[PDB]
């Protein structure tokens, strides 16, 4: 059984368009399946879920879209402030509005003593982003008489990034492409890789029990 | 038509051992298939493969094993030499027999002028490996003036890194697993990924072919 599961949420945008709907009826499906998953593998024993919510490279997306879905994720608290899961958000927070800031802030803050499942939601994060801060972290420190360069290695780099040990057993993404798409780069050394053309709205139980029995066979 | 082909070249010892056959019967199928590969690969128009032929986790393979890869990769000169592949080898090249570097580092400047395929061969390399040296580097010259914090960014980490731009395209993994297993991490960010159950012995130019139109289909 995996403890920690990477989730690629991808299909939501192609699940609306396919259908000839806006992409906005694709997205509202994204956190509540999300909550569904979550309840799920909690009671599976599943551990941590780190799920890819808005990478780094999705800011290119149409403005109207963009804001849309920066407005939808302050839906945050209400969706999980009260789940009993413990949320943590990973990604650059400084860039987002500073009503979003604070609603991840609140919802980090009334769920850390949450000892069920660990939801980490990667928003604004990318692989290049968080190799890119620890190591501007790292550098501060060698030029503050911290460490030496011999000092740099992986676990140093692990007390670094955003995304932390233990790192993902299994990766699921949804949608039908088979690429990591700049998710947790570092993270994904070892972990084994499960696509599913299954699009993220449509994900269900039988789907996410079928991607661990792929799993449990090794 | 992919520019650049990772190629994880997996399922050389349990192809040996399935037939009950000692490992070493494995072994001797991987650089004629990578040629083979290679030069499928260069009439294909394909310009560039990256192929991991040792992890710096291989090390904790039985010792003998070990030893007897360490003395086929000296083969590297009489397989590479005059196939008119430019040849280069990435990975922790001072940990190697000395007898080995000299063979890596001539065939080298034999090849270097070869204007085909260029074939880089990770041996004795990983993707921590990769960004850890880079890092080094990155650090070293901050603690010399030569950059500051706000100057690190992916085009200095491509600068560093050993595997560089153009990165991979396509990356075939051979032998069934589903991972990248410390491959090129950061190199791997927007890769499709094409996993084929076929051991890396048996993989031939129906099978390439093959990953190649499923790379196609987007």
Redesign the interface.
Known sequence: MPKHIALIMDGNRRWAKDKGLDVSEGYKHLFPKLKEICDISSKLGIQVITAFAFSTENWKRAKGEVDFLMQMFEELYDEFSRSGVRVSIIGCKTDLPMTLQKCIALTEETTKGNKGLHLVIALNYG??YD??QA??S???K??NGLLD?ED???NL?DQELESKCPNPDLLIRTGG??????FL??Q????????TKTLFPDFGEEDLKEAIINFQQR
Chains 1, 2 share one sequence.
């Open positions: 692989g290049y190799i890119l190591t501007k790292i550098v501060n060698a030029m360069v740099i290695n992986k780099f492409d088979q690429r990591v798409s700049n780069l570092w994904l050394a070892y972990t084994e890789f499960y696509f």
